[PDB]
Amino acid sequence: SLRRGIYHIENAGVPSAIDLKDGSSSDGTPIVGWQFTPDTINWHQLWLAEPIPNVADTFTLCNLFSGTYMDLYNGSSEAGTAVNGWQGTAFTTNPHQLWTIKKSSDGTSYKIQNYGSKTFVDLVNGDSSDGAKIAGWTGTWDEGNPHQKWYFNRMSVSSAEAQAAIARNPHIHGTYRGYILDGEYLVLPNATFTQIWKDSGLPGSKWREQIYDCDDFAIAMKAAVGKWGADSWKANGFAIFCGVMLGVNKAGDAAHAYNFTLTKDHADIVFFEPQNGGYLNDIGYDSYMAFY
Amino acid sequence: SLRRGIYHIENAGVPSAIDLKDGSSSDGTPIVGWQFTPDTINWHQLWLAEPIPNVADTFTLCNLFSGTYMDLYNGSSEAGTAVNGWQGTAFTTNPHQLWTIKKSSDGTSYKIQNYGSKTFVDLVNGDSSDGAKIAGWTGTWDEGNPHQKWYFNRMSVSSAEAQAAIARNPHIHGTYRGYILDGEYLVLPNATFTQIWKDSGLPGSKWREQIYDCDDFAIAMKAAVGKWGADSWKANGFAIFCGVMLGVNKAGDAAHAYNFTLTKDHADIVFFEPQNGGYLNDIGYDSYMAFY
Numbered sequence A, B: 001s002l003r004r005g006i007y008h009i010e011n012a013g014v015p016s017a018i019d020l021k022d023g024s025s026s027d028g029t030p031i032v033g034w035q036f037t038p039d040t041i042n043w044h045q046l047w048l049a050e051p052i053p054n055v056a057d058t059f060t061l062c063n064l065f066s067g068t069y070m071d072l073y074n075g076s077s078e079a080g081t082a083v084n085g086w087q088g089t090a091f092t093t094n095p096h097q098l099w100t101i102k103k104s105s106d107g108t109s110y111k112i113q114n115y116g117s118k119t120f121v122d123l124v125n126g127d128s129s130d131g132a133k134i135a136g137w138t139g140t141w142d143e144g145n146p147h148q149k150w151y152f153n154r155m156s157v158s159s160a161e162a163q164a165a166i167a168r169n170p171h172i173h174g175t176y177r178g179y180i181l182d183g184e185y186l187v188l189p190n191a192t193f194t195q196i197w198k199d200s201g202l203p204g205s206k207w208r209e210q211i212y213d214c215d216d217f218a219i220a221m222k223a224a225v226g227k228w229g230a231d232s233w234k235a236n237g238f239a240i241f242c243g244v245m246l247g248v249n250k251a252g253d254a255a256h257a258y259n260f261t262l263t264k265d266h267a268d269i270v271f272f273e274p275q276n277g278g279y280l281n282d283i284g285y286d287s288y289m290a291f292y
């Protein structure tokens, strides 16, 4: 089954993503096809999939920005029925907001079926225009129709995935202990991670013995990303990925505190120096503790 | 010997503290006797004692607020010589700024002798008035004269002392690991710890699943205290005490993240709930990790 997490949902036929129009929280805001920029946060185009207990392959889909849910208007099975953002909750019993999401016949893209109507999410006429209508539409699980096929591009990691990325890194100390703080994390492109740093007041901060040294920079960066996450998104049930690490050098005579993020492919960690905004594959320290 | 740390230096005869007048960083700012309020941060009256390597019982005394040093004017041995704040460094060879500090004949208070002049820090005429002159003055190590006797009231803890306070607490999990970040810490009265919290934006922050939950509040509070430390004091070589803890309940089925501070007597820790500003001797969790 599709895993719990945050997805950028991209049509299989044309490069249009599922977009809540203007990110609006109003009930009935149309959900439309819209172009996107890879390796950015696409602000109106991120969807938190929450599995429904006891209902196989079925999910609510919550817009990360608005906190409102993908909703089939009045649950109508009529072809052309509006698909809109609407107030709801993560584990609602409202079938208008419940979606069975399973692999299409190509085995890579998914089809998205309303649980009540049994109709499918359809980019009408495969229109690649910004603001193209998305509707519930008659269809089948096995047909090739690209109007109803959707790539679920995973934008989050589970804590287990983050832990695996750390574990395969070559700069981990033998004494390493990791402390996990949340369960599912939006992975930032470096462009956004950098922006948060740039706006944090840290670029302007002076290194000062004990009173504002390694530990203070690293903790301040983590706090900055935490604040950004809450200020930026209205959905709940996920965190923003930003780790803190304490490390020791090879000679075992010097220590450092710093941050880390994740690669685009989610497979590896990358170290971040909060004193200068630099990204490094080797920061010159082996991590003996991390929290994230 | 007197230990490295931060001291509130109180005359033995009258309740006047050593005060850098108006906290001014100007060279030549008079150091004077001034009244004080116990259980507050006395902003102009905190002194960081740095031991000089291989000069027994001898220290620089740096005002925490100004970053400037206690300085005997032109190193004169004349009775009545000005004692002022003056620019310097922690390990200076300038004898005007070097002070031999040893127990008086009462075995509890200290005398403070200029390393160059061999004269003593003297509250002139035992004057208890605010702004009373402090001067270098003839004297002896053994005499009873209270004008030249000073209680060194310790306002900081070493990391070892902090570690000991944690270790004697009854709410520590069997699996506990602690991660020490600095070496010497100003202990805040709860009044000041609370003030930092009140101004941090946390009192007005909503708990939100993963995106702004326990860990976010605890880390935000630590970052707030770190920012406050650097913004508040010009001296270097110390940090402000504020810990983060992760804990698990007795039933082992729920976890929490929170902060901790120290008691006035420095012997014990006290838990702090960043979601509501409360202080607790028992927060209902046993700590399995701490950083501070």
Ligand SMILES: C[C@@H]1O[C@@H](O[C@@H]2[C@@H](O[C@H]3O[C@H](CO)[C@H](O)[C@H](O)[C@H]3O)[C@@H](O)[C@@H](CO)O[C@@H]2O)[C@@H](O)[C@H](O)[C@@H]1O
Pocket: A079, A122, A123, A124, A125, A126, A137, A138, A139, A140, A143, A145, A147, A148
């Ligand atoms: C170009 C066109 O593609 C297919 O039709 C789609 C529609 O397909 C869906 O609805 C039809 C009934 O209208 C039928 O139930 C089909 O099984 C289902 O996938 C639909 O995607 C609309 C709106 O976007 O566009 C096209 O009309 C195909 O069935 C047609 O024969 C034709 O090849």
Ligand SMILES: C[C@@H]1O[C@@H](O[C@@H]2[C@@H](O[C@H]3O[C@H](CO)[C@H](O)[C@H](O)[C@H]3O)[C@@H](O)[C@@H](CO)O[C@@H]2O)[C@@H](O)[C@H](O)[C@@H]1O
Pocket: B079, B122, B123, B124, B125, B126, B137, B138, B139, B140, B143, B145, B147, B148
């Ligand atoms: C009341 C007074 O107390 C003592 O005198 C102090 C001064 O004491 C210091 O300086 C004197 C010389 O002036 C001498 O060297 C002494 O050993 C030394 O402690 C000094 O503290 C001043 C300034 O505050 O005040 C008093 O004059 C004592 O020696 C006097 O006989 C007399 O009892």
Ligand SMILES: C[C@@H]1O[C@@H](O[C@@H]2[C@@H](O[C@H]3O[C@H](CO)[C@H](O)[C@H](O)[C@H]3O)[C@@H](O)[C@@H](CO)O[C@H]2O)[C@@H](O)[C@H](O)[C@@H]1O
Pocket: A019, A020, A021, A022, A023, A034, A035, A036, A037, A040, A041, A042, A043, A044, A045, A130
């Ligand atoms: C928040 C807002 O985001 C951008 O505008 C969105 C727009 O974003 C997508 O489309 C644009 C071009 O229109 C780019 O491809 C972006 O990479 C996409 O993410 C859509 O979401 C529409 C419809 O909901 O709303 C706009 O606000 C950006 O252009 C703005 O400057 C701004 O940052």
Ligand SMILES: C[C@@H]1O[C@@H](O[C@@H]2[C@@H](O[C@H]3O[C@H](CO)[C@H](O)[C@H](O)[C@H]3O)[C@@H](O)[C@@H](CO)O[C@H]2O)[C@@H](O)[C@H](O)[C@@H]1O
Pocket: A027, A071, A072, A073, A074, A075, A086, A087, A088, A092, A094, A096, A097
């Ligand atoms: C059949 C109908 O179901 C519910 O109403 C839906 C509505 O549901 C959501 O929004 C309303 C406010 O409009 C409430 O907050 C619900 O809790 C939400 O789940 C939407 O799905 C719209 C648009 O498709 O359709 C309505 O039917 C329920 O509130 C009604 O009482 C009634 O049972």
Ligand SMILES: C[C@@H]1O[C@@H](O[C@@H]2[C@@H](O[C@H]3O[C@H](CO)[C@H](O)[C@H](O)[C@H]3O)[C@@H](O)[C@@H](CO)O[C@H]2O)[C@@H](O)[C@H](O)[C@@H]1O
Pocket: B019, B020, B021, B022, B023, B034, B035, B036, B037, B040, B041, B042, B043, B044, B045, B130
């Ligand atoms: C920063 C400033 O601190 C206080 O004023 C200081 C003053 O502080 C001490 O004396 C006052 C009475 O004048 C109280 O006893 C305090 O508890 C002491 O710490 C002195 O340091 C003088 C001389 O340098 O400077 C003043 O600025 C306080 O009264 C102010 O409101 C303010 O917070």
Ligand SMILES: C[C@@H]1O[C@@H](O[C@@H]2[C@@H](O[C@H]3O[C@H](CO)[C@H](O)[C@H](O)[C@H]3O)[C@@H](O)[C@@H](CO)O[C@H]2O)[C@@H](O)[C@H](O)[C@@H]1O
Pocket: B027, B071, B072, B073, B074, B075, B086, B087, B088, B092, B094, B096, B097
């Ligand atoms: C003997 C004298 O010693 C030094 O001057 C001191 C002076 O020293 C501090 O302040 C000056 C600037 O005035 C420099 O930053 C020094 O590095 C500091 O240590 C003060 O102690 C004053 C007041 O007592 O006395 C002067 O004698 C040195 O700078 C001189 O060149 C000269 O060697």
Ligand SMILES: [Ca+2]
Pocket: A011, A012, A013, A014, A015, A016
């Ligand atoms: Ca395409």
Ligand SMILES: [Ca+2]
Pocket: A181, A182, A183, B210, B213, B214, B215
């Ligand atoms: Ca958490």
Ligand SMILES: [Ca+2]
Pocket: A200, A201, A202, A205, A220, B227
């Ligand atoms: Ca800052």
Ligand SMILES: [Ca+2]
Pocket: A210, A211, A212, A213, A214, A215, A216, B181, B182, B239
């Ligand atoms: Ca520090």
Ligand SMILES: [Ca+2]
Pocket: B011, B012, B013, B014, B015
């Ligand atoms: Ca007294």
Ligand SMILES: [Ca+2]
Pocket: A210, A213, A214, A215, B181, B182, B183
């Ligand atoms: Ca440090």
Ligand SMILES: [Ca+2]
Pocket: A227, B200, B201, B202, B205, B220
């Ligand atoms: Ca805040």
Ligand SMILES: [Ca+2]
Pocket: A181, A182, A239, B210, B211, B212, B213, B214, B215, B216
């Ligand atoms: Ca969190």
